[PDB]
Amino acid sequence: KEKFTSLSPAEFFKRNPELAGFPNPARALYQTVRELIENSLDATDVHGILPNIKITIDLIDDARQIYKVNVVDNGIGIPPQEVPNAFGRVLYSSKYVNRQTRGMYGLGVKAAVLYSQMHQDKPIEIETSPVNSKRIYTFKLKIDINKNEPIIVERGSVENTRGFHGTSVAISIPGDWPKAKSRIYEYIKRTYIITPYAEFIFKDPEGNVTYYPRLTNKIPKPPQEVKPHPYGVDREEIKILINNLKRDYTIKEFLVNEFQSIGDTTADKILELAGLKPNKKVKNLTEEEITRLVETFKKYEDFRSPSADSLSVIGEDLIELGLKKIFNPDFAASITRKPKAYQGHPFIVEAGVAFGGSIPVGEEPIVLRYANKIPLIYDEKSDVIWKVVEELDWKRYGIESDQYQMVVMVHLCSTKIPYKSAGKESIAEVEDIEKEIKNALMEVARKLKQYLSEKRKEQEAKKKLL
Amino acid sequence: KEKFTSLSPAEFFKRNPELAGFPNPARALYQTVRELIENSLDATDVHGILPNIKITIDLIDDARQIYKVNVVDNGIGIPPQEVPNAFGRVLYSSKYVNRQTRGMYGLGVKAAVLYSQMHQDKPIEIETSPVNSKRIYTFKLKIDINKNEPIIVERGSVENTRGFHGTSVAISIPGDWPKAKSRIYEYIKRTYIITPYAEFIFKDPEGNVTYYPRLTNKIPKPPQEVKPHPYGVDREEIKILINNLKRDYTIKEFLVNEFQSIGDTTADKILELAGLKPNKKVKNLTEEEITRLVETFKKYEDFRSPSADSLSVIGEDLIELGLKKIFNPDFAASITRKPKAYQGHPFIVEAGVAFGGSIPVGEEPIVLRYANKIPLIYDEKSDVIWKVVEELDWKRYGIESDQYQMVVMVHLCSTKIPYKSAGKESIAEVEDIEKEIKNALMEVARKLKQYLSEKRKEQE
Ligand SMILES: Nc1ncnc2c1ncn2[C@@H]1O[C@H](COP(=O)(O)OP(=O)(O)O)[C@@H](O)[C@H]1O
Numbered sequence: 036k037e038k039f040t041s042l043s044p045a046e047f048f049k050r051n052p053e054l055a056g057f058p059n060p061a062r063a064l065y066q067t068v069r070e071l072i073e074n075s076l077d078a079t080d081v082h083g084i085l086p087n088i089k090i091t092i093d094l095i096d097d098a099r100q101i102y103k104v105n106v107v108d109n110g111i112g113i114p115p116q117e118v119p120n121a122f123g124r125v126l127y128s129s130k131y132v133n134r135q136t137r138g139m140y141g142l143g144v145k146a147a148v149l150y151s152q153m154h155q156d157k158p159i160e161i162e163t164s165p166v167n168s169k170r171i172y173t174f175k176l177k178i179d180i181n182k183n184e185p186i187i188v189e190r191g192s193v194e195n196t197r198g199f200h201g202t203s204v205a206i207s208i209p210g211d212w213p214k215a216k217s218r219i220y221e222y223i224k225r226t227y228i229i230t231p232y233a234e235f236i237f238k239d240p241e242g243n244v245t246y247y248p249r250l251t252n253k254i255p256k257p258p259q260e261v262k263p264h265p266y267g268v269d270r271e272e273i274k275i276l277i278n279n280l281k282r283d284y285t286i287k288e289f290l291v292n293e294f295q296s297i298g299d300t301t302a303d304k305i306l307e308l309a310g311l312k313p314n315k316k317v318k319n320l321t322e323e324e325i326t327r328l329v330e331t332f333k334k335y336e337d338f339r340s341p342s343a344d345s346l347s348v349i350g351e352d353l354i355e356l357g358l359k360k361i362f363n364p365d366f367a368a369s370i371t372r373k374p375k376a377y378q379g380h381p382f383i384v385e386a387g388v389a390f391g392g393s394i395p396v397g398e399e400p401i402v403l404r405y406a407n408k409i410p411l412i413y414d415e416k417s418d419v420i421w422k423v424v425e426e427l428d429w430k431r432y433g434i435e436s437d438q439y440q441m442v443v444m445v446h447l448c449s450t451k452i453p454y455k456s457a458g459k460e461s462i463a464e465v466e467d468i469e470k471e472i473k474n475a476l477m478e479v480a481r482k483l484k485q486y487l488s489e490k491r492k493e494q495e496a497k498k499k500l501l
Numbered sequence: 502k503e504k505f506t507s508l509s510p511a512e513f514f515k516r517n518p519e520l521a522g523f524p525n526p527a528r529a530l531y532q533t534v535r536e537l538i539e540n541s542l543d544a545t546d547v548h549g550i551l552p553n554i555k556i557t558i559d560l561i562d563d564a565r566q567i568y569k570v571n572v573v574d575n576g577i578g579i580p581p582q583e584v585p586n587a588f589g590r591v592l593y594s595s596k597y598v599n600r601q602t603r604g605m606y607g608l609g610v611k612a613a614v615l616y617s618q619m620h621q622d623k624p625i626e627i628e629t630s631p632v633n634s635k636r637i638y639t640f641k642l643k644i645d646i647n648k649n650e651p652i653i654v655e656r657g658s659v660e661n662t663r664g665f666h667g668t669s670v671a672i673s674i675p676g677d678w679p680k681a682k683s684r685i686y687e688y689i690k691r692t693y694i695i696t697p698y699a700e701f702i703f704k705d706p707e708g709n710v711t712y713y714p715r716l717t718n719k720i721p722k723p724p725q726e727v728k729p730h731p732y733g734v735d736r737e738e739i740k741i742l743i744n745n746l747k748r749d750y751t752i753k754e755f756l757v758n759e760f761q762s763i764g765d766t767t768a769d770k771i772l773e774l775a776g777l778k779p780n781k782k783v784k785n786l787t788e789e790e791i792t793r794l795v796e797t798f799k800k801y802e803d804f805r806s807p808s809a810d811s812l813s814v815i816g817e818d819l820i821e822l823g824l825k826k827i828f829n830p831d832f833a834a835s836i837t838r839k840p841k842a843y844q845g846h847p848f849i850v851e852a853g854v855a856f857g858g859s860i861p862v863g864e865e866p867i868v869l870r871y872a873n874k875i876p877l878i879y880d881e882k883s884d885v886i887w888k889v890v891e892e893l894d895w896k897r898y899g900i901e902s903d904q905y906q907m908v909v910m911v912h913l914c915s916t917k918i919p920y921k922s923a924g925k926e927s928i929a930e931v932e933d934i935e936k937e938i939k940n941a942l943m944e945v946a947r948k949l950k951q952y953l954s955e956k957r958k959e960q961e
Pocket residue numbers: 070074075078108110111112113121122127128129130138139140141142143144145202503
């Protein structure tokens with residue numbers, strides 16, 4: 036006999052930790068480190084703070100292979116009333132607002148906590164002080180998995196006599212340092228290369244310390260919350276927008292006020308195409324009217340692009356700088372494309388190419404993938420970026436031979452990155468994004484083609500001297 | 502200022518449908534089809550019913566590219582009181598018990614419903630008639646994503662005069678038939694090849710109808726609920742086993758009764774290793790004692806394997822038959838390995854190899870992945886199976902040229918397949934599973950080596 040039951044979100048990820056990027060102790064150790072670093076970065080640069088991040092990993096128990104990961108930052112901290120749910124309630128986040136941040140699910144640190152409880156018995160340790168806080172608040176926490184709620188094992192407070200702000204998080208988990216080492220270092224290095232306004236200190240389980248110095252004191256304009264672009268906004272999103280209204284808007288007012296890229300004239304045209312009365316109260320839209328609006332948004336070809344301003348890009352200068360620093364190529368080029376939209380979300384693709392020099396020889400490019408300023412490391416061959424790179428005919432762009440020295444970099448940034456998994460690491464096959472990654476790659480490949488054509492012309496001239 | 506909020510499980514998957522295997526209309530059309538087929542199979546062969554499954558896809562709106570997918574089965578149906586939550590509450594399942602079924606998350610059909618709701622306005626339609634039912638119970642449903650609760654648009658019943666028993670589900674979604682066509686047909690074909698006791702009818706949007714007739718009326722022994730194997734059972738799972746006890750067991754009694762592969766002699770050895778009192782009441786285990794138990798389980802080297810009868814395999818004969826039917830090779834061999842355990846879950850790897858004949862020449866093996874009797878189609882290169890196949894040195898097993906005609910098939914079955922995502926198209930990197938996949942592949946590769954050795958000698 037079939038017996039029907041429900042799960043809490045915590046039970047769901049406890050039963051299936053592989054879904055959150057915790058399938059084995061090597062990947063788990065890596066995942067915990069990056070989840071904490073991403074939280075610390077979102078807590079600093081999103082708020083105009085030059086990040087100073089300290090990461091330590093200690094082997095606590097050799098026989099059991101338990102490691103303690105501690106990440107300390109100079110971020111905005113967390114209000115003490117929010118700490119228990121922030122670290123101990125699955126699907127709880129400050130990043131569900133429409134804004135480019137590394138975090139997005141309200142899952143990552145809880146998944147590390149669940150993994151922690153599944154395999155050892157020490158609670159997670161949080162110390163935090165909000166900006167201008169008179170106290171440093173401390174917590175020891177577990178998750179009641181059935182209830183999906185925090186258990187406060189311990190809480191305290193101490194006088195903040197040094198005016199410190201930020202957060203320390205320490206979590207004890209199974210790990211495999213030897214297997215995870217190269218990917219943890221690659222993660223931090225690739226973060227650092229595109230984040231020169233940050234400083235990192237990293238102490239590993241072998242007691243090695245690496246220092247990654249701040250190279251610039253200029254911080255990018257922090258991304259902020261924005262209204263959706265109408266292209267690809269769906270029926271449920273329309274309902275959300277309507278339900279959130281404090282005013283009794285007409286449909287016309289709703290269009291101009293709740294979206295980017297809609298003025299009076301665009302609103303009039305959308306209303307005409309969708310068969311909607313400008314003056315009807317939007318709270319009264321029917322199910323079928325909502326469909327018509329969503330379809331109209333989808334097929335409308337005259338929308339202005341989203342503002343480049345919901346997003347934070349790496350930028351052509353830095354992309355090129357970083358490719359040169361790491362690979363010492365004969366040639367490098369990059370492009371930061373103009374903003375597009377997919378499913379209501381502004382996005383930008385940036386692309387870079389490096390060729391020759393110290394880049395090793397192979398039969399395929401080295402592909403460097405980033406999403407919202409996070410370097411992607413695992414699962415590359417199923418990423419949509421890899422799909423696009425593989426499908427491009429490099430013979431069209433001057434790559435004559437089967438063996439060559441090329442690096443290709445792609446950064447996607449958006450108010451929402453569509454990952455294939457909650458562990459992130461790879462980007463899903465979304466058609467508008469796929470198309471724009473291709474256009475961007477084609478644009479830099481054209482700069483490569485020019486470089487290779489000039490080299491070829493020189494060679495041809497030299498050939499005549501023979 | 503940072504504003505902290507919560508999401509319901511419905512809101513989570515509506516915001517991130519890519520996580521459930523709904524990233525674009527082509528994959529979504531495919532995913533909807535397979536989620537429904539897998540639901541129908543779990544409702545039939547798990548209950549000793551020879552599955553009779555009909556799949557129809559109709560293009561209902563050309564301009565908007567909206568398709569209606571209807572799957573009809575002869576399964577056990579759903580109790581009418583359970584239908585609204587079964588189809589309209591995210592994280593609600595009958596497959597949370599420890600048992601080999603295709604389904605596992607309590608999400609799949611709800612994810613299709615969310616995708617349906619995001620893009621069009623017709624509700625999902627369910628008709629169901631459990632065994633002996635004199636009525637067919639009908640529903641139209643939506644999901645209130647904020648509450649994660651069903652919305653009942655219609656609900657009723659008619660007398661069951663034609664003796665329908667089973668379930669019909671129809672759902673309208675955006676799709677891309679031209680792009681999904683080959684993978685949908687591949688999915689049904691590979692399911693049929695390993696499920697000869699099932700009968701399928703497929704009507705596609707172009708009006709093609711394909712019949713896949715039943716070839717045998719002998720169903721495999723249905724998979725049942727089973728006890729965990731102690732190796733890799735975690736601390737939270739120990740707590741659950743303790744909370745579920747209906748008697749005041751000692752730790753010793755706990756070990757013998759609640760786990761596979763622990764007889765009283767093994768229990769004595771574990772209690773000694775873990776430093777636990779045999780006669781202590783298990784409800785009194787401290788946090789630290791649970792840790793020691795779990796570590797002891799992980800390190801104990803003389804556990805017997807779990808019972809093979811826990812799981813439902815394809816079997817060597819059927820694997821080889823299937824390979825021969827698809828590829829017409831010169832050589833085929835297969836192995837159904839003895840059971841292993843990972844994270845407290847029994848699993849079996851089966852592996853097949855085919856060489857030569859009508860297999861095309863290429864630079865790598867054709868790799869056929871299956872998990873809990875489902876053919877995997879997307880994301881092959883990120884799959885742990887692919888990792889093992891790729892990392893194997895085929896030169897050690899007779900493949901000398903860079904070009905060659907080889908098919909490799911791997912089936913993993915378990916009380917739990919660890920997928921990389923809830924879209925269930927690739928298996929995660931779990932080391933016990935990776936190791937056993939390699940071991941199984943090596944075993945069949947040895948048979949290949951033998952074939953290739955004799956073939957090489959004959960060439961002169
Ligand atoms: N180091 C930190 N500093 C400030 N806030 C943090 C920090 N770590 C976590 N948070 C807060 O806790 C919330 C939950 O964190 P997490 O589970 O990692 O989810 P996510 O980062 O995807 O939102 C975050 O949205 C953020 O508001």
